[PDB]
From a paper:
To shed light on the effects of the introduced mutations on the enzyme structure, the crystal structure of the S394V-EUGO5X mutant in complex with 4-n-propylguiacol was solved at 2.9 Å resolution. The asymmetric unit comprises eight enzyme subunits forming four compact dimers. The overall three-dimensional structure of the mutant is virtually identical to that of the wild protein as revealed by an RMSD of 0.49 Å for 526 Cα atoms. The pattern emerging upon investigating these stabilizing mutations is clear: four of them (S81H, A423M, H434Y, S518P) create a better side chain packing by presenting bulkier or rigid aliphatic groups, whilst the fifth mutation (I445D) substitutes a hydrophobic residue with a charged one on the protein surface, and might contribute to overall stability by preventing protein aggregation and/or exposing a more hydrophilic side chain in direct contact with the solvent. The sixth (S394V) mutation of S394V-EUGO5X promotes enhanced chemoselectivity towards isoeugenol formation by favouring substrate dehydrogenation over hydroxylation. V394 is located at the entrance of the cavity where the substrate binds. Notably, this position represents the connection point between the active site and the wide chamber located at the subunit interface, which may comprise the entry passage of the water molecule which is used by EUGO to hydroxylate the reactive quinone methide intermediate. Therefore, a reasonable explanation for the higher chemoselectivity and reduced hydroxylation featured by the S394V-EUGO5X mutant is that the more hydrophobic and tightly sealed cavity of the S394V enzyme may hinder the accessibility of the Cα atom of the p-quinone methide intermediate to water, limiting the formation of the unwanted alcohol side-product. Specifically, careful inspection of the electron density revealed that the substrate is covalently bound to FAD in two of the eight crystallographic subunits present in the asymmetric unit, whilst in the other chains, the ligand was found to be non-covalently bound. By comparing the subunits with covalent and non-covalent bound substrates, we found that covalent binding is associated with a 20° tilting of the bound substrate.
Residue numbers in the entry:
A (entry chain D), B (entry chain A): 2 to 526
């Protein structure tokens, strides 16, 4: 049928749509079923339809965002703000609440407002992609570098606002985010930090401004629609070298983590954000599943062995990058070589020492860790026909026993639900994201429903072991926020009071992070 | 006269006090004029008395804080929460609103709950002073170091909660704060980050947890009473060396800042938070005003020259610390010498090469920058009889012109109001605090009132040049928050709805950072 906002008639919605068209122009409101299918979750989860958009609106300016918000308030139309809407693995551009309108800020608000060489920052509109920014930096011959995630088509703004991560020293995007401009849920515009002081040049210099520090409350949040964002850019070091360490055994995970933490916590010699990818993760990047195993079932141990031998990779594959003058890079690599060399079967390769298929991932990490955005890692989705992923990412202490327990808990459930377990340990200073990508056939309703049920079990089971996810998909947001229920759901109750204060009509992205406004609370979604 | 909360009778206040005694014990509630005088602002601003506490309550469990907040809600008693209450230059323990009850959490909640060597963090109760933490690190022979402000008698928690600053690479206290436990304004307890997930080991490992990031909203805020807070501790490097660069001329400020920025933005070779102190600031630390000038009125040029000659300092004095193996320190120091050496009159001294009276500041900075707390800088308040200070701290871009333009704006007003202008530029990566201390005779109303009117003009004047302060005194919080009025006071209105949602009875520290709850708005308060 026609997809409508909850409790909005065909009559009110057509009226709301015409008002939208009056603000942004006829060409920049999408509302037909055929055109709207590009904005559904490319990696859908569950058998039944979920997260359907009623319309897509593409404003050009802050003021247009204001009027769109003002219209939504009058007609009770829920608004789902996105930038480039490439949140793939977490719902893409699809809104949490079926029937919501996508506000695609990125389509036409895509200008690089400023790139300041002296102070090393960028002021961006949501539409500026990692590729967009890299092209700017290269063309203007910049000494600065950006920090990208695995896929470069994302928004520097959009990624920050869901607290996504990169892999250079500037990997923590929210940390380096400096100032923003947001349209609050009833259409008022506000600037944070020094942007709040008229005429200040310090908007991108000093994050905090004066009084309570709000910026964080607009990340993984439904408290507004962001129209501008500042971020800090690191200067490109004079040289760099990337390396791979293959580890033969599954049980090697324990010592890898335990050896890694002393080398990582002081940001030297492990300067970048190290990643520890399993053989499944790496194999999927360069090959199809059917190359190794033709059956329907958890892959047998001999099949795993073929992947390792043929790709010349270990069960665990450590990828790092070193920066600075060659002598410093030499000393740091020397230290890494001999800390990790204490593990039987460890083998060491630099980005200059491997041109084979197996070294494709090392060559890609070398680009990502040097602020060169890539799409090469889209090849993962060729693992199986109509390939999709969901991201189940629990946060772990950098401890080999915690890491082993998590590895074994997840592989256990993946085998049960007949999904390949692909893992990438992203290592911060004192914490670790255990990235589990589950790749499945999107066109097969049982794969979708198996993915949904399996991850709901893993959310619950991880919680009973004392682990939470940093970020999750539309389908798991209620299940994930339910796990942060210390003091009888104290945190959700806190977020609920603020959402109802700023958004009294419950307009902005209802259900985001399991945070529902009053008019939707207890309403079976 | 007995000091009472606004609109609360003696009978109703006596009842509230007795209820407080039933919770904390009668010996931990102070309500008599004589005992309350210790809790006045030690550095009072303006002639008329202001910021008078009605009572002081010292709970020693979260459970007691909850009960006290619930009582305050019943009786409409305003609560001002403090840790050690040593916020000197900004009001000390004194509440913004006259009549408020101080909740001194630090008196009895003063336990180090954990210090973890492996992950390098501490979980602290508000009462733990920098001296307390240092003592612990030393007793247990820890490899970690803390990051303290200039005065070590404050709270690690309390300092963080006002976004205070230290001078080690971990100088950004809020940045390294990881998890907290807060009592919300109606008595409910909440844990943030991974603390919100029951049984998680990652509370002090991963700050963000899931969904919106709230921790910042409890800094320079009146949204609750913090009972526990995590902070990361940096590993003590193998060696360190501290240095002083004296610059002879006032006008040298420009080239110093311009030369500093390239050396600072990459955290090397300026690894430390550098401070640039003027000859007044350093003179005050080791000598009284009457050693140079027994006159009344701004200090003459020959007196300024005598200070420089006698202390063997310049007008501007640069104080840095270098960390790591001696070869690394030696190369960094080499770079700093020929960069700054381009300024005519620059001179260099290491902490090992100066034991004269002028080098006390250098010896004190060497302590502070290595995580060794100090009170040596209390000598600053002997400048004049009954000395107190206020902190006027505008944020400045690391631009020589901008630093210069501020320097003259402030000195201009200081001379007009017959206050000596003492400056310490604290230099972050891409931003500087222009710390302006005004030292004055707290015992004469003219001096107090001259300080109040001068800092009001300097707030207003700095705003018209596009500069805002990062932190301010009780007396200036409305004037300061008034300057951040982009979008027609957009920022304050946002804060106000959050305060009103979480605090419908307007209990917690009304007027903090110029943020008043409903019942006080437009009330000459
Ligand atoms: C499939 C996949 C995904 C992936 C990845 C590898 C693969 C194979 N590697 C990632 C990585 O290394 N790091 C990372 O952070 N994410 C990674 N992903 C996930 C995803 O592809 C990327 O994170 C991607 O960059 C996110 O998409 P995009 O950048 O386009 O973000 P968005 O969809 O526009 O917005 C994300 C959410 O933020 C909120 N939002 C966005 N804009 C606004 C505005 N203007 N106002 C308010 N809220 C906004 C919304 O919640 C939105 O959904
Ligand atoms: C006079 C002076 C001051 C000074 C300084 C040098 C001199 C000569 N050098 C400083 C420095 O280098 N860095 C810095 O950050 N401050 C410096 N100061 C100022 C002062 O000495 C310190 O900032 C001091 O550490 C602050 O006092 P303290 O640490 O005792 O903080 P507090 O009074 O306990 O609390 C501060 C405010 O935070 C809120 N607060 C505190 N505790 C709580 C709890 N538990 N819950 C909720 N809110 C809390 C209040 O708003 C309180 O006013
Ligand atoms: C190959 C890395 C994938 C990846 C990294 C971080 C993420 O948050 C994520 O979410 C879907 C996926
Ligand atoms: C002598 C340094 C003083 C100092 C440093 C940081 C501050 O915030 C401050 O405020 C009063 C004072």
């Amino acid at each position: 049928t026609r997809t409508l906002p909850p409790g909005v008639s065909d009559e009110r919605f057509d009226a709301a749509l015409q008002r939208f068209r009056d603000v942004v122009g006829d060409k920049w409101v999408l509302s037909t079923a055929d055109e709207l299918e590009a904005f559904r979750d490319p990696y859908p989860v569950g058998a039944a339809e979920a997260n359907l958009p009623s319309a897509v609106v593409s404003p050009e300016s802050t003021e247009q965002v204001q009027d769109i918000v003002r219209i939504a308030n009058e007609y009770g139309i829920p608004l789902h703000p996105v930038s480039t809407g490439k949140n793939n693995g977490y719902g893409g551009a699809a809104p949490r609440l079926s029937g919501s309108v996508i506000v695609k800020t990125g389509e036409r608000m895509n200008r690089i407002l400023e790139v300041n060489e002296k102070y090393g920052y960028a002021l961006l509109e949501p539409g500026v992609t990692y590729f967009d920014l890299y092209e700017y930096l290269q063309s203007h011959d910049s000494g600065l570098m950006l920090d990208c995630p695995d896929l470069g088509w994302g928004s520097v703004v959009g990624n920050t606002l869901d607290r996504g991560v990169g892999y250079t020293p500037y990997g923590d995007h929210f940390m380096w985010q400096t100032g923003l401009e947001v349209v609050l849920p009833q259409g008022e515009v506000m600037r944070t930090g020094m942007g709040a002081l008229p005429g200040s040049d310090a908007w991108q210099l000093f994050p905090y401004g004066f009084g309570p520090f709000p910026d964080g409350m607009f990340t993984q949040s439904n408290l507004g629609i962001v129209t501008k964002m500042g971020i800090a850019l690191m200067q490109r070091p004079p040289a760099s070298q990337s390396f791979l360490i293959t580890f033969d055994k599954e049980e090697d995970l324990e010592q890898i983590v335990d050896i890694m933490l002393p080398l990582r916590i002081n940001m030297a010699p492990l300067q970048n954000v190290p990643v520890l990818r399993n053989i499944f993760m790496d194999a999927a990047a360069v090959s199809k599943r059917t190359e190794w195993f033709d059956g329907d079932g958890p892959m047998p141990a001999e099949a795993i062995e073929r992947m390792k031998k043929d790709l010349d990779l270990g069960f665990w594959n450590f990828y790092g990058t070193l920066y600075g003058p060659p002598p410093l890079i030499e000393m740091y690599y020397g230290m890494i070589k001999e800390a990790f060399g204490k593990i039987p079967g460890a083998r060491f390769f630099t980005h200059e020492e491997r041109d084979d298929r197996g070294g494709h991932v090392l060559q890609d990490r070398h680009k990502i860790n040097n602020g060169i955005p890539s799409l090469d890692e889209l090849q993962l989705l060729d693992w199986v026909p109509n390939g999709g992923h969901i991201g189940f990412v629990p946060v772990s202490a950098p401890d080999g026993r915690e890491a082993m327990k998590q590895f074994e808990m997840v592989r256990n459930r993946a085998n049960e639900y007949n999904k390949d377990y692909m893992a990438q340990f992203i290592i911060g200073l004192r914490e670790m994201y255990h990235v589990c990508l589950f790749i499945y056939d999107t066109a097969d309703p049982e794969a979708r429903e198996e993915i949904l049920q399996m991850t709901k079990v893993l959310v619950r089971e991880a919680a009973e072991a004392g682990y939470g996810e940093y970020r999750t998909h539309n389908a798991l947001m209620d299940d994930v926020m339910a796990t942060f229920n210390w003091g009888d759901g104290a945190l959700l109750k806190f977020h609920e009071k603020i959402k109802d204060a700023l958004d009294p009509n419950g307009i902005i992205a209802p259900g985001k992070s399991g945070i529902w406004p009053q008019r939707f609370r207890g309403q079976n979604l």
